[PDB]
Amino acid sequence: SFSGYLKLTDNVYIKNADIVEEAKKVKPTVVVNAANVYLKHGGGVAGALNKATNNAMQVESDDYIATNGPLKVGGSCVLSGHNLAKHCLHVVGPNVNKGEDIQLLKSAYENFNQHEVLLAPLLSAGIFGADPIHSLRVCVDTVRTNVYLAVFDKNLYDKLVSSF
């Protein structure tokens, strides 16, 4: 099971870890991907998860978009977790670097409530441009199911814990 996580609330836990390595070790029921609306997994968490699947995540994602069209910002879809998890919940948080509305971050975290337990990154953080301290606050105030947050950067992890 999940190990070495610091407890933040009744249901939110956090660890300084690479979500790829965490997923390979735990093989959770659900791993969250920090997706974009086109499911083009180029960089950040999405690029790293896709690379770990040997591009199988991108092949499945392209078939999903060809059938269904793009997701909405704040929306999600459930696909295979391949070699990382039973399922991957692809969630689209707003990308501040593309000018998207930061109020959609709460809608993005609401997708997590459809799953009892998840391994996840902070949405809209990293290359999506939002303040990770804000993202953690919205996560704690929105998600009611059990969420295990993996924060790649050690210095950001320490700041997130110390300012919580």
Q: Which residues of this chain interact with ligand QL6, rule CB under 6 A? A: 18-20, 34, 44-45, 48, 121-122, 125-128, 132, 151-152
Q: Which helix (H) or strand (E) holds 25?
A: helix 19-26
Closest approach, Cβ 90 to ligand QL6, in A, equals: 12
Measured from the CB atom, the residue of 14 and 79 that comes closer to ligand QL6 is 14
Shortest distance in whole angstroms from residue 22 CB to ligand QL6: 9
Cβ–Cβ under 8 Å, residues 40 and 20: no
Point out the residue whose Cβ comes nearest to ligand QL6: 126
Q: Judge whether 19 and 150 are in contact, CB under 8 Å.
A: yes
Nearer to ligand QL6, 63 or 153 (CB): 153
The least distance separating ligand QL6 from the CB of residue 91, rounded to whole angstroms, comes to 10
**Torsion sign over Cα 23, 83, 40, 79:** negative
Phi, psi values for residue 53, rounded to 5°: -90, 10
- 79 or 122: whose CB is closer to ligand QL6? 122
**Terminal-to-terminal C-alpha distance of the chain:** 25
